[PDB]
Design a protein around this nucleic acid. Sequence first.
DNA 1: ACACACAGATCCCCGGGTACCGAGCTCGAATTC
DNA 2: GAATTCGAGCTCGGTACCCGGGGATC
Lengths: 1091, 269
Amino acid sequence: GPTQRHTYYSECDEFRFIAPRVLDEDAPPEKRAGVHDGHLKRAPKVYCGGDERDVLRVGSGGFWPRRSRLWGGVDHAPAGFNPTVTVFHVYDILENVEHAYGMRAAQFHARFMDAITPTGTVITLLGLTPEGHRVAVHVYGTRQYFYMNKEEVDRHLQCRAPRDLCERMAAALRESPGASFRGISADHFEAEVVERTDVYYYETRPALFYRVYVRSGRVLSYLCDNFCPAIKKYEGGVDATTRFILDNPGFVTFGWYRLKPGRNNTLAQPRAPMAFGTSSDVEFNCTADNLAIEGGMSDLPAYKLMCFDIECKAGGEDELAFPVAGHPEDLVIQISCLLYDLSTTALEHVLLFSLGSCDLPESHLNELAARGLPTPVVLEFDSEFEMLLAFMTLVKQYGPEFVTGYNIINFDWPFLLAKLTDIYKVPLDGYGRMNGRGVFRVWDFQKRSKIKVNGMVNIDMYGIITDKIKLSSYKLNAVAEAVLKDKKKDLSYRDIPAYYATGPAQRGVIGEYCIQDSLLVGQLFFKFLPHLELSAVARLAGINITRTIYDGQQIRVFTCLLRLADQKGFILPDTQGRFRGAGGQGARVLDPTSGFHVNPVVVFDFASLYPSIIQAHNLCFSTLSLRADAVAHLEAGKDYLEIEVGGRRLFFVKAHVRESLLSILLRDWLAMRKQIRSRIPQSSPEEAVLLDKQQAAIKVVCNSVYGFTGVQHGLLPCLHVAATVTTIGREMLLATREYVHARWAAFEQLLADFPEAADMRAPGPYSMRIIYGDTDSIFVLCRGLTAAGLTAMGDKMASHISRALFLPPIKLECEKTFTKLLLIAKKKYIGVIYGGKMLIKGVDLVRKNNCAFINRTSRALVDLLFYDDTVSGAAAALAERPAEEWLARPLPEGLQAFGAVLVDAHRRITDPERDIQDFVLTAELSRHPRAYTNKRLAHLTVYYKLMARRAQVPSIKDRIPYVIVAQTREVEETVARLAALRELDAASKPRKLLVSELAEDPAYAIAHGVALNTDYYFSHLLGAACVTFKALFGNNAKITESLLKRFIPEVWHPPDDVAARLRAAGFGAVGAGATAEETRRMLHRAFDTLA
Amino acid sequence: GAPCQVVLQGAELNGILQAFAPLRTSLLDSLLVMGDRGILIHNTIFGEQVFLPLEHSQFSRYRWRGPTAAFLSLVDQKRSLLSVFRANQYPDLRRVELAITGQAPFRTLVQRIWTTTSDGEAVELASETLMKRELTSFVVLVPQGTPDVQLRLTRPQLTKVLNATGADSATPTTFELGVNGKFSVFTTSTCVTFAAREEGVNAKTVYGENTHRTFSVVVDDCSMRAVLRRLQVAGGTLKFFLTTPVPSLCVTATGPNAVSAVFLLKPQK
DNA sequence: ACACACAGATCCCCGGGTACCGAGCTCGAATTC
DNA sequence: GAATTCGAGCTCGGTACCCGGGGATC
Ligand SMILES: [Mg+2]
C-alpha cells in the first residue's frame, strides 16, 4: 500500500521484443538479419553466468546490489532496522507540492497536515546517515510569498488592507481562463502589511508594503505573470527552497544536520514505510525548526555512484551508422555499470548488461582481478528492452546518489530515455529518487543538455572535464590518455558488428570494452571529485546541488542577496517579465598595441575586481538615485558619488548613510574565503582538499555577482549598477593607468617610494606604461626593470595603488610577471611567466581541423619564438617599424631559426617518406550525409569514393580521415567518374582541380599513393602561423603571410613534359641542374641568340 | 648595398619603359635570371616560350659580380619587379635601382623607385620598393647562336604572316621556302608569300641573312597568331633554328629592344 | 487528481560565389593613305 | 582612286573581395 503510486516497473510481464537475429545461431543467413522487432509476454529474464531470473525481481538473491528497502511496496530491509539518526546528512533538497489530501494516508500527526491543508510546498531533504542508511527528511513549514506596494494595490486594485487584497488575488486565480487553479479559498493567501524599503532607487523611501503569503509555486508563477502587469509585484519568483534556507538562519543545502527537540517538544516525525516518498531507508518529516546544522563534521557518509556507459549497434536494415533513438531497428547492445562508493572511492560492483550470451575475455577477468577490482558480473539478455529495463532498475534499485559517465546527459541518458519513453513506453517519472512523479527529464538545449533527475545528482563528466581540463579532443579515450595516461585498448564501432555477430567471446570483447570505458570514467570522477566542489557551492549559495549543476549562475547570487535583503528589511522585484522560458570610450588608450614584449610585463590584475568595486563604492540598487533631489540633503565629495554612466547622472551614496547589499554580501564571503585559506596548513590533507573545495565555491559565487546584475532581462537586473560597475572598472583602470603614468613614470620616484627597486634596475631606459587592459587586468610593461625580484615589488605596487587611490575593499595584485609576451588581440596573447611556463590566452595553438603535422610544426614555431632567446629578441625588434616596412627591410637576423622550421614543415610534406599517416584533417561530418547543401566537400569526396571503392562507412555520426593528394594525373577522370556516379541514376588544363575534388583517402593514399599535396597543407600551416604571428606585424595578415612565405626556398623547374620537347629542341640550360659554371656561359648564349 | 648593382636613370629608364610599353601585362608573372651580361626575363605565353633579354648595356649602370641569381618576378605573387615598368603605372618615374645583397646560394634582391614631384624634387616611395629572394634551384632553358635561316619582317608583313597562318587546331600551319628566293607561309586555306633578298649584312620584299635555305616546316599547336598578337608585336624578324632534331623558330621584335618568342614545330612531314 | 510542465542557444573560421569593380586583351566606324 | 583602327562591347581569367554554413561527443 504505497501512498504515492510508484511509476517505475516493479514488474512488467510484456514488453516490445527487439533483438538482433544475429542472436540465434540456428537462423541461417537469410533469417540472420535485421532486428527481430516484435512482442512477447514473458517477464524479462536476465542470465548471469549460468543463472537466470527476472530482471525485475527482488528475491532472496540478486545479481546486482540493492539499496532500497521498498521496491514495489513490499518491505525488503529486515524486521527491525530503525536507524535512529540524529546527525543525518543532506545531499539534495527537492521541493514539491504535496497536497495534504494527497498525503492523507501518510499517517502523520496533525502538524504537517494542518500546515498545508489544501496545498503547500514540502521541501524533502534527501541524505544519508553515518550508520549508512539512506534517508530523507521533509521540511513542511515553508511558504513562498511576495510583496506589492501598499497604495499601488490598495488604490489600483481598489481593495483595502491586505486580507481584502488576498481575496482579490484568489479571485484572479479562480476567475481565470482554465482549471489549472482549483478551489482557492482566500485563507490560502494569508497576508500582512510590512514596511520593507525598495531595494531599488533609495530615494524610494522605505515604503509601506503588502506581503501576501502564497502556499504553492504554480500559483505563484500565475500570480507573477497573470496578475496586473502595472504593479511590479515584489519577490514572487522565489522558490520554496530558498525561503526554507534563508528564513531559517544557518541552514545549508548540503552538509550535516541535526534534529533538534524544542518549542513544545516537536521532534521530527518518523515515516511509516508504506508512506515513504523516496528510495530512502528511513524517512522523517519535520518542520524547519525541528532541524539544525552542525559544523566540523565534514565527511560524506558512504554515498554511492554509478559510472554507467552504454554501447549500441546501429544496424537498421542496412547502412550501419550512428544509431538513433527513434529507430526501433537501432538499438543498445551492452551497458557497463560501475557502482562505486563515494567516501572511500572504492569501486564496489562491476555490472555489465549484455544483449546475448557474453563471455568476458579470460584476459579481462584476470586483469580485473589483478588490479584488485571486483569480479565483473556480466548479465546476458535477449532483447534491448530487457537490458534497458535492467539497467534502469539498477538505477532505481541501487539508487546511486550520484551518477556519472561520459556524455550521459548528451547521449547515454538521452538515448535510454528516448528508447524508454516512445519505443518501450516507460514512464520515467519514477525512476529517480522519488517513486511517484518526480522529475526525470532531459531538455535537449543541445550541449548544455540539461538532465534533471530528482535525488540523483547527475554529475556528468563530459560537462565536468570540459570545465576542469582544457584540451579540445574530449573523446573519452583521448581524455583518459591525457588526464590518466592509462594505456587503453580502444575499440571502434566497425567491430561492433564484427564482434557482436562473431560470438559470445567477441560479444564479451565488446563487454570488455564497455567495462574499460566505465572504469576510465570512474577514475575520472574520483580524481576530480566533482561532488565536493558542487556541494560546496550548493551549501554556500542556498540552492540544491542539482540546481548549482544545471540552472544558471545567477540563482546563487540571487538567493544569497535575498538573505541579505531579508535581514535588512528589503524587497526584491520580479522583472517585468520572463515572457516565457523554453526547454527543448575610455578604453582606446588601454588596448593591445599588438606587439611583442620581452620586457617583463607585470600583471596587476585586480583581485576579484568587480566585487571589489561593488563593495568599495557601495554599488547596489538601494544606493542608486536618479534625481539629485534624492541627494539634496547629502554633501558631495564625502557623502556621495555622482557617476554618469551613459548620461544618466546616477548618485551612489557612500557607506555611512546606506550600506550596499552587494557590498555586505561580497564582504562576508571574501572574509570567509580569507579565513579558510588561513586554515589550510592546520588540517589533514584530505581536509585541505575539502577546504580547497570550500574556498573554490566561495571564489566562484563571488565572481558571479557582476554577471548577476549586468546580464539583461533576468533575475534582478539593474543595468545601472552593472553600468557603473563596468564604468568604474574602466575609470579605475584609467585611474591606475594615469596614476602609474603620474607617480612612477620616473624611476627615481619609484625608488623613493619602494627602496627595493635599487637593485631592480635594468641597463636600458625605464618606463611603467600600461600596454593592455581588460576587465580586471592591466599589463604594465615595466620597461627597464628586471623580472627576477619583480613580483615581490609588484605586490607592493599593487598594495600602494590599492590604498593610495582606491577604496579599502579594492586590492590590486601583481599575480604574474611575463618575461616575454606577444599581445595578439583584445583577448589573445602568448606570454611566458617568470618561473617559466607558456601561458597562452586564447589563440588555441592546436587546431584539430588542421592535421597533426600542422599543429605540431606551428606549436614548434611558437615555442621557438618564445623559448629560444636570440629569436625572441628579434621578434621584439619586429615591432619597432610599421608592419609594411618589414616588406622591404629584411627581418632581424634572430628570426632565422624561425624560418628554418617552416622550411622543414614544407620539406617534410614533399620528402620521400610520402606520409606519416596522421595528416588526418578530420571531417566532423555534420550530421546527415546526402543532405550537404553545398556538396563538393573534401570529406564528401571521400564519402562517395568509398561508396565506389571498397566502402566501409559508419556514415552518419562519423568523421573521415582524409588526405589531399598532389593532383595525381589520373584523378581528373576519376572526379568525372564521380560526376556521373555522384549522380547515382539522377588537354584543357581542367581548372586547377578543386581541392575538395582532391581529397584522396588515407589508407588508399598510403598503400600506393605518393608525392603528397603541398599547397593545401602548407597553406593551412601558414594560415595558422599568420593567425598567431600577425601580431608581430600589427595584425596585417597579408604582411604576415608574405613574410612567412618568404622563408620557403621555392624551386623552379619547367615541367619535364615540355623540358622533354625543348631538350628535343636542344635548348641550352641555365640553372641548378648542378652545372654551375655553365649557367654563366649559357646565359651569355641566350643573349647572343636573342638580344 | 649589394656588390651587384642595377640602375636606370631617366634616359635609360625611358628606353626600358618603352621596351615594356609596346604593351603588356605579359611578363609580369615572369622569371628573371640575372647575371653577368644582364637580366634575362623569361615567361611562357600560350604554352610557347618568350624571352626578353635586358642587356647590361641597356641599363644605365649594371654590374653583376657573382653567379646567376634567379628571381620569380611576382614578389608575393601580386607585385612584380617589372610592374613598375609599364606605360602609365606611376607616370613620374625618374630612377629605379636593384641591389641583390648576400651570397651565391642566398642572394636577396631589393628594388627601389624614385618619382619626381613639382619643382623637380625626387621622392622615393617606401611602399613601392619590392624585395625578392633568389631561387635556391632554378633550371631554365635557352635558345642557341647564329640561326639556320633568318629574315626581316615589318608590322604589315608580320600582320600578314600571323593572319595567314595560325588557323586554330585541326589546321596544320606550314612555313616553307622556295627556290628563286621565295618565302611562303601557307595553311589549309590561306597562302601568303614574300621574296627575301640580300643587303641585310612592295610589302613582299625583305632583306635578310641566310637567304639561301629552304625548308617545309610545320607548327603543330596554333599559338603564333596569339602569342605574337598578345605581346602586341609591331613586326620584327624571324630566325629559324633547324639543326636540332626538332627545329625551333624565334620571332623577335626588331623595334629597338626585343621580346622574342621561340616556337617548337611539328616534325617535318 | 494531481494538471502533466518549464520556466538562455548562441556566434567564428573555412569554403563557395561572382553582386558587381576593375583590370587586361581581343575587338567593329569612325580615322589616315 | 585605294583600306585601318581603336571603340564598344564581349569574354576572360580571374581575383579578390565578399559573401554562406561551423563547434558540441556518443
Ligand atoms: Mg556515454
